[PDB]
Design a protein around this ligand. Structure first.
Ligand SMILES: Nc1nc2c(ncn2[C@@H]2O[C@H](COP(=O)(O)OP(=O)(O)O)[C@@H](O)[C@H]2O)c(=O)[nH]1
Ligand SMILES: Nc1nc2c(ncn2[C@@H]2O[C@H](COP(=O)(O)OP(=O)(O)O)[C@@H](O)[C@H]2O)c(=O)[nH]1
Ligand SMILES: Nc1nc2c(ncn2[C@@H]2O[C@H](COP(=O)(O)OP(=O)(O)O)[C@@H](O)[C@H]2O)c(=O)[nH]1
Ligand SMILES: *CCS(=O)(=O)NC1CCN(C(=O)CNc2cc(Cl)c(Cl)cc2O)CC1
Lengths: 161, 158, 154
């Protein structure tokens, strides 16, 4: 059976854990590792997921997951300009550790349910276009885009393989 | 607000009209509907192709006009599933693009006489890189999901 | 039970094509026995095509009116106001059964949008039905809806 090691990266507080909880546990209320078998396009897939902002205690485990991670969600929040500005850093770090220019990634703009917006959808779309990766708008609260984000990433991994 | 022109294609008798009627009128025996998808209100305009679709020239016109396509087969009609590749190839040819919003739809899911397995259809959709939704115009299973997913694919393309 | 229906609208909007599609069921004063709302009805349909504008008896006698414009003919839509006002004046009533009909819906382009027509029909307090005499889309709906409006009035 196929396993996918996924890493969810982005600034503290953008909703990485919330997105992963919604995917895996199917709830939201207002732990950084998860493991579950799902079915994606008829293929049974074990997802092994790590959420990380890059500043957590277990750096050794983080470096391991970065090296073996097959795909990455690059997450910012639409009401957090700094988190959007941080995306380039995260992508550059992944490319360095993987020593590759072809790493499966999806850009995720979370908290789309909130009326406070400081990052334009066009900004994000433009950035994702430059990187050659999909952009998905999500809300961990309403479930908007959550399956799409993770499943699109799994589809990017298959493309790569 | 944003209007999306949608075209439902597939073999005669797979339930394209039935799917449309179930979407718009919530009935199983009007082509426009306002919907909210992912927080955005949109107008679905399903092109009415009845009568005219028998002519290739008109089919070409509808394909050029449409922004996204449901590729419908019936799960108790193997030939209708086999016909899907041809229909997709015509859309790609006419719109001169290898990237056109489409969703694969396996209709009549309520029937026991299934001859097209979920796996066969999933494999096809995975190859095309498009969503696959199983539907029944009779029970309403999957009907909103099929059309709303197509809108999502159109939005991604644009 | 007889219903006297009158089809009005600018030249070339499809008044005759709609009438013939209803009666004879093909695309190019009339009577047709129909069943509507379970009731057997005799429809007397006056196609005013070619009728000279200079028909007081037909209007006063007419029980319901199809106000037809073509969705690719802005002027024909503008002309609907004329017909509406003329009929209300001549019949001397504010409650005359009418249906607004936007014909030629099969054409690939349109210059009168659905919202425009829906809003005008709302102003008038009448139904709006999009039709194609060519494909028969909406044709029965238009005439049957008018019969229903007459019944509500009666
Ligand atoms: N309204 C809203 N709040 C969210 C969303 N995602 C996360 N949150 C909230 O944002 C805060 C931080 O989320 P968290 O998952 O801990 O962020 P992380 O540090 O990236 O793992 C929490 O209070 C969450 O409930 C969302 O999509 N919408
Ligand atoms: N049992 C079942 N019958 C269906 C379904 N959808 C359509 N039908 C029937 O299939 C036949 C053809 O449907 P229709 O909408 O006319 O097909 P079209 O030619 O693709 O537009 C009709 O007898 C419908 O009642 C479905 O989901 N379940
Ligand atoms: N494409 C299309 N042409 C129509 C339709 N209805 C009428 N026509 C054409 O428009 C022209 C005028 O139709 P006609 O019935 O004579 O209009 P009238 O003057 O209002 O009675 C003719 O060439 C018809 O064939 C329709 O629904 N679609
Ligand atoms: C149901 C018999 S029919 O001859 O009237 N319609 C056929 C025509 C051939 N065909 C398709 O090409 C696939 N469906 C389809 C494609 C397009 Cl582009 C359009 Cl506009 C409409 C339809 O139905 C099957 C149905």
């Amino acid at each position: 059976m196929t396993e996918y090691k996924l890493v969810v990266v982005g600034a503290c507080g953008v909703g990485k854990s919330a997105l992963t909880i919604q995917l895996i546990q199917n709830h939201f209320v207002d732990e950084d590792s998860y493991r579950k078998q799902v079915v994606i396009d008829g293929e049974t897939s074990l997802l092994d997921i790590l959420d990380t902002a890059g500043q957590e205690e277990y750096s050794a485990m983080r470096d391991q997951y970065m090296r073996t991670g097959e795909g990455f969600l690059l997450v910012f929040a639409i009401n957090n300009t700094k988190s959007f500005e941080d995306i380039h850093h995260y992508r550059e770090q992944i490319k360095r550790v993987k020593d590759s220019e072809d790493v499966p990634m999806v850009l995720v703009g979370n908290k789309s349910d909130l009326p406070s917006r400081t990052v334009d959808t066009k900004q994000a779309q433009d950035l994702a276009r430059s990187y050659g990766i999909p952009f998905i708008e999500t809300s961990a609260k309403t479930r908007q885009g959550v399956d799409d984000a993770f499943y699109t990433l799994v589809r990017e991994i298959r493309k790569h393989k």
